[PDB]
Design a protein around this ligand. Structure first.
Ligand SMILES: [Cu+2]
Ligand SMILES: [Cu+2]
Ligand SMILES: [Zn+2]
Ligand SMILES: [Zn+2]
Lengths: 153, 154
């Protein structure tokens, strides 16, 4: 089995774990984010684990299958598309509790060494009918991010 | 195909370190620099976890897939993560990092992607110290900066 972790750096903080039991099974993504503004926040794995230029150098959404942007349940989506995490209140602690079959901790869809990004605005899941929607989901600015690294156990 | 990775060091000192590998079978070339080191040798290793949950402490021990004891990069017995020392020629300067190693890789069993690069306060004795810590940490002491090693653009 495999485990990875991301510690967010930026306007919000938090520790997000990734657990995968077998190469064939989905990845369970858990942990908590603190200091999010109330509301929905876009949440994606971006291609590069590069923070030489803050979250900007993370590049675009991780997209090994060469698709347009969507939500995690969209028929068309980036592998890195994990939708929104939602703060129910201002200045609280948002639980992260996601499972996804596209991302992996092994092989071509492996997210090890890539970057988890939290956004300022809601991910519209690619339903905005413009170029931005098909690329970023109009999630706006990158407010925090971290490189996804191998974790204990 | 050719691979690249990068690590941004944060802590008491800072820096950016690049890793380049032409082939899955070629050595890894490590370049970049570290700013602010005190004059002298400073231990420099890849640690096993890319885990920053408890600062550089949670990066765990030196990356060691071959189950060996600590040494320098040229030691017959070493950790894969053992990259020896970086040496600051002056106080408060910028130290060039210029290393090539064939044990570390950006692919496979020995891949360092998703692991942590750590700079230490004291010199790594390359496992030629006369105590138990030598054969494990090289007596490099405090972890003064670290970063997770991430994939970088071609
Ligand atoms: Cu994003
Ligand atoms: Cu070390
Ligand atoms: Zn996307
Ligand atoms: Zn070692």
């Amino acid at each position: 089995p495999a485990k990875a972790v991301c510690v967010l750096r930026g306007d919000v903080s938090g520790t997000v774990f990734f657990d995968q039991q077998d190469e064939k099974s989905p990845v369970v993504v858990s942990g908590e984010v603190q200091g999010l503004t109330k509301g929905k926040h876009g949440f994606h794995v971006h291609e590069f684990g590069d923070n030489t230029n803050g979250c900007t150098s993370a590049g675009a959404h991780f997209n090994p299958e060469k698709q347009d942007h969507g939500g995690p349940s969209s028929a068309v989506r980036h592998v890195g598309d994990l939708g929104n995490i939602e703060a129910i209140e201002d200045a609280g602690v948002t639980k992260v509790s996601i499972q996804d079959s596209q991302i992996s901790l092994h092989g071509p869809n492996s997210i090890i060494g890539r970057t988890l990004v939290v956004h300022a605005d809601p991910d519209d899941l690619g339903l905005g009918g413009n170029e931005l929607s098909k690329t970023t989901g109009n999630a706006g600015g990158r407010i925090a991010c971290g490189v996804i690294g191998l974790a204990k156990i």
